[PDB]
Each structure stands twice: as structure tokens, then as C-alpha cells.
Design an enzyme around this catalytic site. Structure first.
Site, short mmCIF file in Angstrom:
data_model
loop_
_atom_site.label_atom_id
_atom_site.label_comp_id
_atom_site.label_asym_id
_atom_site.label_seq_id
_atom_site.Cartn_x
_atom_site.Cartn_y
_atom_site.Cartn_z
N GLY A 14 0.84 -1.20 0.00
CA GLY A 14 0.00 0.00 0.00
C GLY A 14 0.86 1.23 0.00
N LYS A 15 0.53 2.20 -0.85
CA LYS A 15 1.16 3.54 -0.89
C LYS A 15 0.03 4.55 -1.05
N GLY A 19 1.33 7.56 3.75
CA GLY A 19 2.61 6.86 3.76
C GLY A 19 2.50 5.55 3.02
N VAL A 21 2.36 0.93 3.48
CA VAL A 21 2.33 -0.30 4.32
C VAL A 21 3.18 -1.36 3.64
CG1 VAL A 21 0.98 -2.08 5.45
CG2 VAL A 21 0.09 0.27 5.25
N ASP A 133 -13.44 6.61 10.88
CA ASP A 133 -13.11 6.46 9.44
C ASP A 133 -13.39 5.01 9.02
OD1 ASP A 133 -12.40 7.28 6.90
OD2 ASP A 133 -10.23 7.15 7.29
C1 LIG Z 1 -5.85 -0.52 6.46
O1 LIG Z 1 -4.82 -0.16 7.37
C2 LIG Z 1 -3.77 -0.99 7.60
C3 LIG Z 1 -3.61 -2.23 6.98
C4 LIG Z 1 -2.52 -3.03 7.32
C5 LIG Z 1 -2.38 -4.34 6.62
C6 LIG Z 1 -2.29 -5.47 7.41
N1 LIG Z 1 -2.16 -6.70 6.91
C7 LIG Z 1 -2.11 -6.89 5.58
C8 LIG Z 1 -2.15 -5.78 4.71
C9 LIG Z 1 -2.09 -6.09 3.21
C10 LIG Z 1 -1.34 -7.18 2.79
C11 LIG Z 1 -1.32 -7.56 1.45
C12 LIG Z 1 -2.00 -6.88 0.45
C13 LIG Z 1 -1.94 -7.33 -1.00
C14 LIG Z 1 -0.61 -7.96 -1.47
C15 LIG Z 1 -0.68 -9.24 -2.35
N2 LIG Z 1 -1.97 -9.50 -3.06
C16 LIG Z 1 -1.76 -9.60 -4.53
C17 LIG Z 1 -3.07 -8.57 -2.78
C18 LIG Z 1 -3.06 -8.31 -1.28
C19 LIG Z 1 -2.78 -5.80 0.84
C20 LIG Z 1 -2.84 -5.42 2.22
C21 LIG Z 1 -2.28 -4.49 5.24
C22 LIG Z 1 -2.31 -3.25 4.36
C23 LIG Z 1 -1.63 -2.62 8.27
C24 LIG Z 1 -1.81 -1.38 8.91
O2 LIG Z 1 -0.95 -0.88 9.87
C25 LIG Z 1 0.31 -1.54 10.06
C26 LIG Z 1 -2.86 -0.55 8.53
O3 LIG Z 1 -3.02 0.68 9.16
C27 LIG Z 1 -3.53 0.69 10.47
#
Ligand SMILES: COc1cc(-c2cncc(-c3ccc(C4CCN(C)CC4)cc3)c2C)cc(OC)c1OC
Ligand SMILES: COc1cc(-c2cncc(-c3ccc(C4CCN(C)CC4)cc3)c2C)cc(OC)c1OC
Ligand SMILES: COc1cc(-c2cncc(-c3ccc(C4CCN(C)CC4)cc3)c2C)cc(OC)c1OC
Ligand SMILES: COc1cc(-c2cncc(-c3ccc(C4CCN(C)CC4)cc3)c2C)cc(OC)c1OC
EC number: 2.7.11.30
Lengths: 284, 294
Positions: A14-15, A19, A21, A133
Site C-alpha cells: 500500500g502507498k 505513507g 504499508v 473512518d
Molecule cells: C488498512 O490499514 C492498515 C492495513 C494493514 C495491513 C495489514 N495486513 C495486511 C495488509 C495487506 C497485505 C497484502 C495486500 C496485497 C498484497 C498481495 N496480493 C496480490 C493482494 C493483497 C494488501 C494489504 C495491510 C495493508 C496494516 C496497517 O498498519 C500496520 C494498517 O493501518 C492501520
């Protein structure tokens, strides 16, 4: 003793303006690492302050691991480290997955469960918390079919503004009673109803499903302005469409009634998260 | 390279614990807060987020962490490590000459004026009052200057935006160093200048602790903490209020000081930190300017 703090950042998942992730690795084990922009430092401080006040532990709340501040040459680096959910966000998941009755109900009950846990004051315990949110990008899908709620950077405790597309009428018309904590719970319930609508669209009945769309896709532009949203929600009092095909399916008929009771113009008429849970447990 | 080895515990007390550790080949200090002093950890973290807080006479920040699994939380602060310890420790075992005494007290004044004065710009620093200044919260550096530590009770003010941030911390300042208006609870809590004036009081007490250890004419006093002679061991809040507020006591100036021009000037300076009227007390900038000239 050795305090192993090294985290291998492996892939950016995530971008945004917030910021980035990252999928990270600590001691062989996936973690998620949110690296804050300078623009969004107050979100790191607010989430860190909340977890310094109460260490939330709930299967439907993203699991906290660490808040890290590191001094750099001429800047401060702020990281939040959490559990990693490899299936990604509910928003992501609904784009190219359809649901059956069991998987739809499981998703929405798990969100209601996490939200009711945030909202409840427990004596001894935890303060009441409103999210402020809630949206499908701030919900993660777990491998067991339940979800968890993420991002407490705008959260308020009892004892940056919300995403405009999900803002309740009282936020858009600036009538929200800011001195009444229940006001913030009622804003989360509005947003939950929109999430319920996003999920229910992707539930198959009689061989029919709707395409994924965000709430109000048909009446506002992408990145809608505050005024765009105020005209739709406050002045014209539009609400998301319920397709005819839902009224052939008992689950979607029940879910339509539920989401209507999250969208009352009068905030105090809206259901509570605990009432939503009870209703969802009596469906099917 | 983020890893740290904890080598030895250099103190355990109401502040939690401090460890000497190793990080990237270098000694660091690792403080693990008391779990009931979580608001101090958060406040220090808020203060050290400010890049322009960095100063030779302020304890250097490396990292802050809050870590948790299940219902356990640990609160860590990682800083530079000063192997000579605190000024309190140093004064126990060392006497001072004129040059060393003035270097110590001017360095503390320089740190305190740096905290108290607002820095304007994209990278700025608000005005900061410490609220727990004492000789255990000052570290001695191998160059003979000191640095101020422990910002858990700090208050911030920006004149530029008219914002005062007092925090929500239940912990109060160290009782032996509390100003009269803190002990009688008449301090104006919505007034940033009141907190700077509390720091000035405590600074005066630290000046007195240091000056006792400066030799003149073959005479020095033994290390003693402020008010050692007039309160019980481990004095209560009310013990302190009695001597400072009811009895109007201040630390006594040994008469041998008046034979030495340096100690005569320092006695004058510490009396102008000790007025019962907080607004009569000198500013940190004025103390720094005076010590620059002595
Ligand atoms: C919403 O907010 C927050 C989210 C997270 C978070 C926690 N676990 C997994 C994720 C993630 C992993 C993998 C993918 C993709 C990659 C591969 N595939 C092709 C599609 C899937 C997307 C998302 C995230 C983004 C952490 C946070 O804080 C540390 C966040 O903020 C509070
Ligand atoms: C500082 O920073 C980070 C630290 C860690 C981390 C690594 N090993 C061990 C620890 C640990 C946990 C808990 C105790 C307890 C033991 C029992 N005792 C009675 C109280 C204290 C000690 C040590 C930690 C917290 C991970 C990190 O990231 C994943 C850190 O960075 C954010
Ligand atoms: C931050 O996060 C993680 C931390 C750790 C971790 C590493 N060293 C030590 C610990 C620890 C040991 C013991 C106590 C004590 C507390 C006192 N009490 C009476 C008995 C228990 C607490 C803490 C932990 C928890 C492991 C993790 O994963 C395996 C973590 O998650 C990524
Ligand atoms: C005040 O506050 C903080 C201080 C420190 C810190 C940094 N360098 C050195 C020290 C130290 C080392 C050793 C002694 C010895 C002296 C002789 N004998 C063996 C007993 C004790 C004393 C002091 C400390 C305590 C770190 C902190 O945070 C990481 C502090 O919190 C901001």
C-alpha cells in the site's frame, strides 16, 4: 538479553498520502509495517496514545504489535507494526470475489463484533471508542472468513477528517453534537451501513450478483468534494439503491432492512452495534 | 541494524529501570518505564519527535518503542549513554575547581534556556518547561558539560499560534525540588510562564548543590540534597510545604562562599531563583548570560 528489533521490509502492499504499508518479517513471522508520511504524523500519535491507554485485544480488531519512533539525520521515522493479513482489505477482496449467504453474514457479523467492542465501555476494562473512518479499505479479511477493523488514527476515546464518501449527514451539515460521545458512535453506524451495502451487493442470489461499486458511485464523482456529498446526503437525502433481486432472497431482504436502520437522517434513530449483532445472529 | 543487547542495569526505581546496552558497537541507555507511568513515556516521545529539540545540553534521543503481545506492554526509550552518570552521582565523589563548576552550571543553563525559548521555522521547537529538573535528571558528559534529561512532565507552548499543551500526567515533580506555588497548589495551571518559573526555582537548587562542591581557600562542603537539614528522610509533600511555604526556608549559603568572588556571584544568582513571587525570579536566558560573564 538480545532485543531483536530488525524487521526485513519485503514488499510494499500500500502507498498513499498516509505513507506506505509493507509486509515485513520479524523472527521468521509476517508483520505489517505502516510507515507514516510527515503529513500524517498525528495519526501515528493518536493510535499510539490509544494503545498506551488500552491494549485492545479482539479477534475483529487488527492486532497491535508495536509503535516505533526512530531518530534520523534530520527527520523522525514513525512505524506502526501489526498483525499481517495476507488476503488484504475487504475493498480489495470484494472487487473479484463473490459471496454466498454464510460468507456474507460471517463478514458483516465480524465487522459488527469488532465495532461493538470498540464502542462498549468496560469498567475495571476499556473506554468507549469511536473509529471515525470506517470503510471497506480499513477492514482486513482473515483466512478464517472473519474480518478485522484497522486504522485508529482518527479514533476518539470516552470514559485529518473522515473519508468524505462515508461521512454521515450530521458531519456534512456540521450539526453533529461534538460534546456527546454517542454522536461519534452514530457516525460509525452510518458508515457501517454503507459497508453492509458494499458487501451485500457481492452476495449471489438466484444466479445474480451486482458488480463491486463504492457507496454513491452513481451520484458523485471519484474523490467527491465535501459539497458533492452534502448535496447528495443532506439536501436531496439520497441513499444507496436496493436492487429488486434482493427482495427474492431472505438474507438480502433482512440485510436491506438493517442497512436502512443505519441510514436514518436522525442519528439517535440509528441501530446500535450491539443491536446489529443480535439481528445478524437471527438471520438464517 | 536495529538490534540492542542489554548488558547491565544501572538503576531501578520509581522511574522504572535503566540499562546500559550495546547498539551498532556503541553503548546506549535503555529505559523501561513503570507500567503505571505510561503518560511519561508518551510525553517524552511527543517531545523527542521534534528534530529541533536536539542540543548538546539535552540528552540525545535514539528511539522510542511501545511493544505488546497479549495483555503485556513494554515502554522503551533509547538514548545516548553517559558513563559518568548523573550530576547527583558525580557530585557525591568529586570536588570542583572554579572552571569546572562554571562549565557545569553554564551547560545546564544553556540546556534550560534552549528548552524555554521557542524556535520558529518549518522545523521548529515550541517553548518547553521541564517540570522535574533535579541533579538526578542531569547527566555528566566527558567534556565537562552536562545534559538535561527526563522530559516526561514537560509542558509546551507556541506564542506563534497561542497554543498551550500541559498534558494529562498524574505524576508530580520531585517533592524536594518543588517551588512554593507547587507545594501550596496556587500555581496558575493555564499560564506557561508559571511552569518556566518552577524550573528556575529547581535550577537554583541544583546551582546550590553544585556550588557546595566547588573548593575555595581549601574548604568545600559535603554533598547534600536541598533541604537535607530541615525535613525528614524521604520527605512528604506536606513536609516540603512546611519548610518552603510555612517556614519560608531556603538553602543556607555557607559563609566561606563570601570570601570567593565566583561563589559570591553564584549565591546572588541562586537567591534570584528563590523569590516566593514567581514573577521576580530570573529567566533562563538571564541566568545563562550572567554565568557567561562570571
Ligand atoms: C488498512 O490499514 C492498515 C492495513 C494493514 C495491513 C495489514 N495486513 C495486511 C495488509 C495487506 C497485505 C497484502 C495486500 C496485497 C498484497 C498481495 N496480493 C496480490 C493482494 C493483497 C494488501 C494489504 C495491510 C495493508 C496494516 C496497517 O498498519 C500496520 C494498517 O493501518 C492501520
Ligand atoms: C524496543 O523495540 C522493540 C522490541 C521488540 C522486543 C524484542 N525482543 C524482546 C522484547 C521483549 C518483550 C518483553 C520483555 C519483558 C520480559 C519480562 N519482563 C519481566 C518484562 C519485560 C522483554 C523483552 C521486545 C519488546 C520488538 C520490536 O519489534 C518487533 C521492537 O521494535 C518496535
Ligand atoms: C511485541 O510483540 C512480540 C513480542 C514477543 C516477546 C518476546 N520476548 C519476550 C516476550 C515476553 C516474555 C515474558 C513476558 C512476561 C511479562 C510478565 N508476566 C508475569 C509473565 C510474562 C512478557 C513478554 C514477548 C511477548 C514475541 C512476539 O511474537 C512471538 C511478539 O509478537 C510479534
Ligand atoms: C535521567 O533520565 C535518563 C537517564 C538516562 C541515563 C543515560 N546515561 C547514563 C545514565 C547513568 C548511568 C550510570 C549511572 C550510575 C552512576 C554510578 N553508579 C553506577 C550508579 C548509577 C547513573 C546514570 C542514565 C541513567 C537514560 C534515560 O533514558 C534512556 C533517561 O530518561 C530520559
Amino acid at each position: 538479553r538480545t532485543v531483536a528489533r530488525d524487521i526485513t521490509l519485503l514488499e510494499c502492499v500500500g502507498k498513499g498520502r498516509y505513507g506506505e504499508v509493507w509486509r515485513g518479517s520479524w523472527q521468521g513471522e509476517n508483520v505489517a509495517v505502516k510507515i507514516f508520511s510527515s503529513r500524517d504524523e498525528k495519526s501515528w500519535f493518536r493510535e499510539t496514545e490509544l494503545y498506551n491507554t488500552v491494549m485492545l485485544r479482539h479477534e475483529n480488531i487488527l492486532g497491535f504489535i508495536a509503535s516505533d519512533m526512530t531518530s534520523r539525520h534530520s527527520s523522525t521515522q514513525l512505524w506502526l507494526i501489526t498483525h499481517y493479513h495476507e488476503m488484504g482489505s475487504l475493498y480489495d477482496y470484494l472487487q473479484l470475489t463473490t459471496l454466498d449467504t454464510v460468507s456474507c453474514l460471517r463478514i458483516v457479523l465480524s465487522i459488527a463484533s469488532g465495532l461493538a467492542h470498540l464502542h462498549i465501555e468496560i469498567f475495571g476494562g476499556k473506554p468507549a471508542i469511536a473509529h471515525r473512518d470506517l470503510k471497506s479499505k480499513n477492514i482486513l479479511v482473515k483466512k478464517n472468513g472473519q474480518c478485522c477493523i484497522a486504522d485508529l488514527g482518527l479514533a476518539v476515546m470516552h470514559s485529518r477528517v473522515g473519508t468524505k464518501r462515508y461521512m454521515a449527514p450530521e458531519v456534512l451539515d456540521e450539526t453533529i453534537q461534538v460534546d456527546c460521545f454517542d454522536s461519534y458512535k452514530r457516525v460509525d453506524i452510518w458508515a457501517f451501513g454503507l459497508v453492509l451495502w458494499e458487501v451485500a451487493r457481492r452476495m449471489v442470489s438466484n444466479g445474480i450478483v451486482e458488480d463491486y461499486k463504492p457507496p454513491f458511485y452513481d451520484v458523485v464523482p471519484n474523490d467527491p468534494s465535501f459539497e458533492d456529498m452534502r448535496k447528495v446526503v443532506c439536501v436531496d437525502q439520497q441513499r444507496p439503491n436496493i436492487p429488486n433481486r434482493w427482495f427474492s432472497d431472505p438474507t438480502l431482504t433482512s440485510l436491506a432492512k438493517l442497512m436502512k436502520e443505519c441510514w436514518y437522517q436522525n442519528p439517535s434513530a440509528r441501530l446500535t452495534a450491539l443491536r446489529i449483532k443480535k439481528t445478524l445472529t437471527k438471520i438464517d
